[model samples]
Every structure is written in structure tokens, then in C-alpha cells.
Target: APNVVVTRLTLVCESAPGPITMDLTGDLEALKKETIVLKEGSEYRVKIHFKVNRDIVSGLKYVQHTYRTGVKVDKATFMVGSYGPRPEEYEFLTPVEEAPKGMLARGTYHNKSFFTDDDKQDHLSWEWNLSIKKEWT
Candidate 1:
């Protein structure tokens, strides 16, 4: 009834994208300055791990806002339905997406994303940086 705690996040990826286990429940601002580098044109999917406490969450939603230089660029959304806290923590593997490629596309990106519910309540929200390089480094 009260909580929807996000544990950790992972990116199921190909092209030897290495490991991407983001600690959503860990340090805050410190990770703020961090930037994740991805191999250009690589395929990846977001894997979320969360837990619901007390009651249930209705029409859970995930939003991704990607931008740069204070300019709007891309936005992605995911639909997560009603979930009742029963036993184990929940895991949701999102749709597959490609990384930005080419010269201009191979740069740093600012992304602001969040988790919201049916009531339009944001359970969690944050902004992070990522870059698409010619190769993963």
C-alpha cells in the first residue's frame, strides 16, 4: 500500500556490452556525474528489478527522456500494469532498443527517466548521462 522499491537495474545486451548492473537503490548524486559508454549500434534492453510493499500498484509506467545541450531529442515509454505484492520481487525486461550511431550520434546524452503509477505518482526519478562510442571501452 505504501511502497514500490526499485532494487537494481540491468541491461540485457549483445555485442559484448560487458556488465551493466546499475544500483538504483544505492548512492544518489555520486552516480549523477557518472556516464555510461555504449558501443554504437549495439542492441540492449532494460531489465528492472523492484519490489512492492503493503498493497498494490496500478498501471505502473516507465518513462525515458533523452536529451542534450538542454534540447529535446528522444522519449521512450513502457507500460507496466497492475501488480500486487505477493511473494518474490518483480522483474520486468523491457523492449529492445539500439544505441545512437554515426558521428553526431556518437556523443554524450542526458537522460531523465522515472517510474510512475496509475495515480500519476512518481515512485522514483533521476537523470543520468550516457555516451555512444565507436567501441565499448
Candidate 2:
């Protein structure tokens, strides 16, 4: 089993009518009270990005990713990769909101990914955490 480690975790917001990229990465201690203002009637695309590295020579079959936020829990997705040892990036767009508001309205991303080796068995996996606030102005 190859060890898994989350190298990067980020949150991006895509506003409605047009796509606006917002990076909501910050200190967890200060993030709980953070506020992000968006269009009052705008819709947002909330997503989590994960980068991981492992040491396995036989190559991996696929990877499954799941995340939780104020909106949902255990929301999942997957990606297929080629064999051997390589750093892979996984992105999951979890929740979409229109005219968003409040503390919970922000995205608190807890991302986890399980790697399946070519042996047809699920092996290594990694998990990480982060949060942010969204508001309307």
C-alpha cells in the first residue's frame, strides 16, 4: 500500500451568468469568521482541489474522492489515472448555490481520496480540511 498525503486544498467560486474565480484559502482560525460578498442573486460553484503523491511502481487503477461541507456530506466523485508513481490532482465541485448567504453558506471543504491499484484493490488514501465564508454586498 502506498502512503497518501494531501499537498494542496483550495476552494473556488464560479458566479452565475458568468464565471468568476475566487480563491478562498486562508487560516482555519481566521476563516470561520471570514465573509465573501457575491451578487445577491448570483449562483456559485463551490469546489475542492486536492494534490497527492505516492510511491507505487505497479500503477493505480482509479481514485475515488469524497467531500463534506455545510450543504452536504459524503458527496463523492472519481478519476482514472495511468500506472506507476505520479502526483495527481483531483477536483470536486460539490455544491452550487444561488443568492447565497450566511456562515454555512460558505464552503468548508473536507476532501478525501482513495487510490485503487491495478491489482483491483483499493489501497492508499488521504484527507485534508479547510473553510471559508461567503456573503452578499
My TM-score estimates for the predictions, one after another, are 0.88, 0.37
lDDT of 2 by residue, 7-87 (tens): 332334454333333232333344334433454435554444434456533444334343554445554344344433456
TM-score of 1: 0.88
Best by TM-score: 1
Q: Least lDDT summed over 10 consecutive residues: which range in candidate 2?
A: 1-10
- Per-residue lDDT value at 18 in model 1: 74
The reply for model 1, stretches above 4 Å from the true place, is none
lDDT of 1 by residue, 49-111 (tens): 788887877889888888876577788889977788866788887888888788777888887
Instruction: Evaluate model 1: give its lDDT.
Output: 0.79
